[PDB]
């Protein structure tokens, strides 16, 4: 009952729209209390947004024609509502960061272009807000998990290259819209795009015949990016994958090299404060 | 700049002498051409020579038809027409019988020209012929019993000459005498004449009928219905056509009362029955002239109905009141008591209004107002008379049915009958002159002398049944008219044989099954071979074969259990040859017994260069089957032979289970070389794929004829000016 599904989604869109309108009607800056509900609000919005997409209907063009004839695309206005709500919300983006980093990724890597084109400036807005918050130091603590979630998204099978080109064009435009921080923003975004094409090559070659050299170059590039950004979680998991693949190809010298990399990026502190270095396959004491 | 055409080549032949070449210009007058010919050939007496065409026409050169002259055409010189006429006249009274025979034959053969006929008649030829015919009555009697065949042939030629002269109309109408009519009558009276003589006599009779009307009365004075029926007994179709045409001529310019009288004579002799048992049951080459005979006899029946239906039935006729009273008595003896027959007219008016308020009649004071419009007029009255006479059970059922209509959709019988009569008159083209080219014939008109009434009865019964099934309303009059027109056209196109069989076939016909089967047969024939249809499918074959080869490669990728050679002494017989997902290398070798199928792993021989494979030999050319020691293969596996030849010294010979997968494997091997398929399975799939695709694409042309000739290319403006913006 796909017609039932789409009517249900249409009424869900109506309900979300009226929720947004009542929130704008009585939950402005004066209602600065209990602002945590917006986290679940946007989580629900993104979960609703992440289905019935282009690839769902891509099996036959007739389905796309009929859906745009009777209802039209809904994810577009979903993104429009999300972006206008983010614009009109306020300067309280600091508390959103650790929660908003994940969900915005799915709309970030959308197969379409126009909605992503209109949605891109939210990244510039959040970057400038993050600088305003973190001028008393650095602001890597967004790009770290941004890269983490981008890697997860590409591992889910949603990477693209002309989208990378569009991203680079838009971020160059936004850096030209900005000041000396444009240099740091653009170099970090260049790192992001290089890592994205890295994972694009990884995914487009993991399905083709095995070659075992381009994947190695891509993985060592991700390791370089992670050690450049002072991030080890994705770095340690990817060197684990490297070690597994090298066990598959009985190459002990590179395995020893990667083990030395892990050892040198592992401190002598004996208290497992950060549990990311452990393995989630089993559950025991796991003392370091 | 076209080259000049003033120079032409033409050879003028002679009887017994070879031709001579000269250039002839048709623009100049014939006198100048003759003078130039005489000057060139040094021939005197230019007025004693002429020109003629040596083609099949064998005609002389005429001012109106001289364009038939073409270069490289045989032309022979002949004697001048004046000399030919003079010698024919001299040999008319010659002493040689053979000379007379050949002269008359030549004159009859060469009597197809009008101007030369005028020239011949200018010499009092008609008067001489009339005098020799009048004086020759007793002259040929002595030698009639000796040379009847030749005399009859010459008489037939003379009759043909007279017929063509009459067709040209050169002979005056007043010049005709009663002597010719008497001679024709005497020829008819003879019982020892041939069929050809009879055909010529009947043609003369019909021509004379076409000439005037009093001569038609004179010939009808010697016409009996009992002599033209033996003519039908002859199985020849041409004599039947001639006799029927003369019969129609009897109905052309005769009084309508005499038309009815002779129609009654035909009915009492039951001519249509013997016609059915003679010409209808004949399965010979039916003539288009016979089709014209059928059409004109149909028109004659229509006129014999019209001359009695064209008149208006006076509503003031008390005899008409009594007739309709008896008709409604014998029709409505369920609601009307039998006692009103001897009753008064007040009960008559009460019955009128009570039985016409349920039959869709507005006026109840003057019920005969609807009888002043013809067609049909009184024809519906005769139809209801016949219904009461023969269909009394159905008549009573209809009477009790129409009055019982509780759907408020009672059909007015009079209006429906008038509409159906108008539609029949329109479709049958009543009131128009006979066509000179159309030859449509309906063999159902000869089943009965009243065949039109029977056809109308069948039509109205079918319409009543169809309306009862549909239970139609007042909003589909156009639908009713179109459906009845289409069903009548479909019934007439079937050429029925008998009324009962025709009525049965009316219901037996499916819902346009004939059209669908004809379309399917035409499509199949076009797919087999056609100029404007067959090229369409073979023009576009880039994707079907590519996807077929892709499917074969996928079959190679999935793979199955293969077989080895000479597995007799502790040797495995099941293994796998799996194609790589890159479709470049083959994984194969000696494997174990795996009932499940292929085991995904690296086999013994993991490499098979496909870029160096020469070909795959199929049949008895396999080197492994040519063993002369102990590894000889069975004769029953000859259809399972295929070897991938490579390195010119080693062979990889595989064994197939049966024929279909052997063909699949050879198709895959040939697709690897980018060649055609060699599988019975593929050809089975090849035909249905193209057929299914064409079946899918023919939807747009449904209900539309597809022209065969390429459509023309109308001119287009040179400029690309867009009044309406693109995109």
């Amino acid at each position: 009952w796909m017609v039932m599904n789409m009517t249900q989604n249409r009424v869900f869109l109506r309900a979300i729209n009226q929720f947004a309108e009542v929130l704008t009607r009585f939950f402005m800056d004066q209602a600065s209390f209990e602002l945590q509900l917006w986290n679940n609000y946007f989580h629900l919005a993104v979960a609703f947004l992440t289905h019935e997409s282009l690839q769902l209907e891509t099996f036959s063009q007739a389905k796309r024609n009929k859906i745009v004839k009777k209802y039209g695309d809904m994810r577009k206005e979903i993104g429009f509502r999300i972006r206008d709500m983010w614009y009109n919300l306020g300067p309280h983006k600091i508390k959103f960061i650790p929660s908003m980093v994940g969900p915005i990724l799915e709309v970030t890597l959308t197969p379409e272009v126009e909605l992503r084109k209109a949605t891109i400036p939210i990244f510039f807005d959040m970057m400038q807000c993050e600088f305003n918050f973190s001028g008393n130091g650095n602001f890597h603590m967004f790009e770290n998990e941004l890269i983490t979630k981008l890697d997860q998204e590409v591992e889910g099978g949603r990477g693209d290259e002309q989208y990378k080109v569009l991203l680079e064009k838009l971020l160059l435009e936004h850096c030209r819209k900005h000041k000396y921080l444009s240099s740091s923003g653009e170099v970090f975004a260049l790192l992001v795009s290089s890592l994205l094409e890295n994972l694009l090559d990884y995914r487009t070659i993991i399905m083709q015949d095995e070659s075992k050299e381009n994947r190695m170059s891509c993985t060592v590039n991700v390791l370089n990016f992670y050690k450049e950004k002072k991030r080890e979680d994705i770095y340690i998991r990817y060197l684990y994958k490297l070690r597994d693949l090298h066990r598959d190809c009985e190459n002990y010298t590179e395995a020893a090299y990667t083990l030395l990399l892990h050892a040198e990026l592992l401190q002598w502190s004996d208290k497992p404060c950060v549990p990311h270095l452990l393995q989630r396959d089993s559950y025991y004491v796991y003392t370091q | 700049m076209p080259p000049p055409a003033d120079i032409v080549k033409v050879a003028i032949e002679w009887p017994g002498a070879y031709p001579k070449l000269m250039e002839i210009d048709q623009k100049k007058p014939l006198s100048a051409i003759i003078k130039e010919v005489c000057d060139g050939w040094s021939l005197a007496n230019h007025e004693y020579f002429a020109l003629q065409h040596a083609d099949s026409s064998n005609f002389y050169i005429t001012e109106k038809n001289r364009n038939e002259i073409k270069n490289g055409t045989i032309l022979r010189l002949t004697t001048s027409p004046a000399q030919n006429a003079q010698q024919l006249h001299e040999r008319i009274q010659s002493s040689s019988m053979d000379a007379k025979l050949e002269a008359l034959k030549d004159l009859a053969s060469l009597s197809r020209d009008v101007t030369f006929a005028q020239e011949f008649i200018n010499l009092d030829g008609i008067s001489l012929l009339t005098q020799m015919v009048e004086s020759g009555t007793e002259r040929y009697q002595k030698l009639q019993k000796i040379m009847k065949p030749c005399f009859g042939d010459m008489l037939s030629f003379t009759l043909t000459a007279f017929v063509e002269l009459m067709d040209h109309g050169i002979v005056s109408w007043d010049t005709f005498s009663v002597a010719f009519i008497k001679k024709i009558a005497s020829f008819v009276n003879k019982s020892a004449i041939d069929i050809s003589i009879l055909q010529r006599s009947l043609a003369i009779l019909e021509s004379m009928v076409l000439n005037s009307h009093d001569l038609y009365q004179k010939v009808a004075q010697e016409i009996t219905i009992g002599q033209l029926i033996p003519h039908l007994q002859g199985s020849d179709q041409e004599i039947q056509t001639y006799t029927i045409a003369v019969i129609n001529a009897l109905f052309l310019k005769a009084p309508d009362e005499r038309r009815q009288e002779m129609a009654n004579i035909l009915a009492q002799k039951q001519l249509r029955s013997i016609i059915l048992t003679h010409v209808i049951r004949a399965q010979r080459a039916i003539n288009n002239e016979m089709a014209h005979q059928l059409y004109v006899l149909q028109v004659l029946t229509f006129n014999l109905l019209e001359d009695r239906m064209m008149t208006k039935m006076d509503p003031q006729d008390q005899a008409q009141r009594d007739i309709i009273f008896e008709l409604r008595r014998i029709a409505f003896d369920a609601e009307s008591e039998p006692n009103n027959s001897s009753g008064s007219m007040e009960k008559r008016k009460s019955m009128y209004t009570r039985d016409y308020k349920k039959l869709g009649f507005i006026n109840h004071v003057n019920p005969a107002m609807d009888f002043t419009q013809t067609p049909p007029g009184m024809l519906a009255l005769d139809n209801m008379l016949y219904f009461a006479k023969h269909h009394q059970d159905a008549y009573i059922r209809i009477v009790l049915e129409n009055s019982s209509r509780e759907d408020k959709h009672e059909c007015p019988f009079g209006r429906s009958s008038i509409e159906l009569t108008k539609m029949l008159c329109e479709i049958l083209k009543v009131g128009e002159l006979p066509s000179e080219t159309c030859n449509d014939f309906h063999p159902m008109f000869f089943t009965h002398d009243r065949s039109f009434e029977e056809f109308f009865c069948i039509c109205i019964q079918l319409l009543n049944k169809t309306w009862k099934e549909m239970r139609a309303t007042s909003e589909d009059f156009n639908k009713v008219m179109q459906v009845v027109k289409e069903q009548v056209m479909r019934a007439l196109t079937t050429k029925p044989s008998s009324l009962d069989q025709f009525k049965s076939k009316l219901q037996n016909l499916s819902y346009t099954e004939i059209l669908k089967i004809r379309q399917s047969e035409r499509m199949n024939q076009e797919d087999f071979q056609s100029r404007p249809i067959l090229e369409l499918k073979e023009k576009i074959q880039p994707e079907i074969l590519e996807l077929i080869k892709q499917q074969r490669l996928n079959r190679l990728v999935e793979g199955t259990c293969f077989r080895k050679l000479n597995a007799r002494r502790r040797q495995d017989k099941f293994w796998y040859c799996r194609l790589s997902p890159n479709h470049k290398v083959l994984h194969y070798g000696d494997l174990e017994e795996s009932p499940q199928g292929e085991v995904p792993h690296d086999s013994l021989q993991d490499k098979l260069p496909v870029a160096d494979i020469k070909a795959v030999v199929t049949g008895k050319d396999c080197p492994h089957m040519k063993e002369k020691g102990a590894l000889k293969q069975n004769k029953e596996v000859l259809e399972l032979a295929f070897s991938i030849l490579y390195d010119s010294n080693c062979q990889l010979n595989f064994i197939a289970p049966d024929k279909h997968e052997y063909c699949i494997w050879t198709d895959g091997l040939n697709a690897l070389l980018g060649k055609d398929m060699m599988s019975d399975l593929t050809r089975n799939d090849l035909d249905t794929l193209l057929s299914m695709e064409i079946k899918l694409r023919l939807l747009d042309l449904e209900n539309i004829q597809i022209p065969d000739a390429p459509p023309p290319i109308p001119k287009e403006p040179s400029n690309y000016d867009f009044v309406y913006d693109c995109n």
Binding site: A62 | Q551, L701, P714, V723, C726
Partner: protein, 139 residues
């Protein structure tokens, strides 16, 4: 190619056979090549072919069967019987889907289901040809 006028009485652009390659945009057109034409000319029609709706194709008037019928066949009284030609157009959509159905049914061998699908589609096209013209009672 001038004097092109917007029109909506040509949504059913009927081809004849493989059109000549005199025009570069034009190829060997198939039988069921409906052109959604948006421009009008006396003897030529250029519009979007169904195979490539983003590519224009100029088709002569003699190559186009005049079809004033639109998608809605009741506004212009095109229906032989009201409320039936929507069925024929949804059946055309169903067959355009059958296209990709058979295009995909060969990648994976579904021989029993494929054969029964063939029989069903054969009956379907038989019934479509039978009801190409509506001349039967409503039942």
């Amino acid at each position: 190619m001038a004097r092109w006028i917007p029109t909506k009485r040509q949504k059913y652009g009927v081809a004849i056979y493989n059109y000549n390659a005199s025009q570069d945009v034009e190829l060997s057109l198939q039988i069921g090549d409906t052109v959604h034409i948006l421009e009008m000319y006396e003897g030529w029609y250029r519009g979007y072919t169904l195979q490539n709706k983003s590519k224009k194709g100029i088709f002569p008037e003699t190559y186009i069967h005049l079809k004033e019928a639109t998608v809605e066949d009741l506004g212009q009284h095109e229906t032989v019987i009201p409320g039936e030609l929507p069925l024929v157009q949804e059946l055309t959509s169903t067959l355009r889907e059958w296209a990709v159905i058979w295009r995909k049914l060969y990648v994976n061998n579904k021989l029993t289901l494929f054969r029964q699908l063939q029989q069903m589609t054969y009956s379907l096209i038989e019934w479509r040809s039978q009801i190409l013209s509506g001349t039967l009672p409503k039942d």
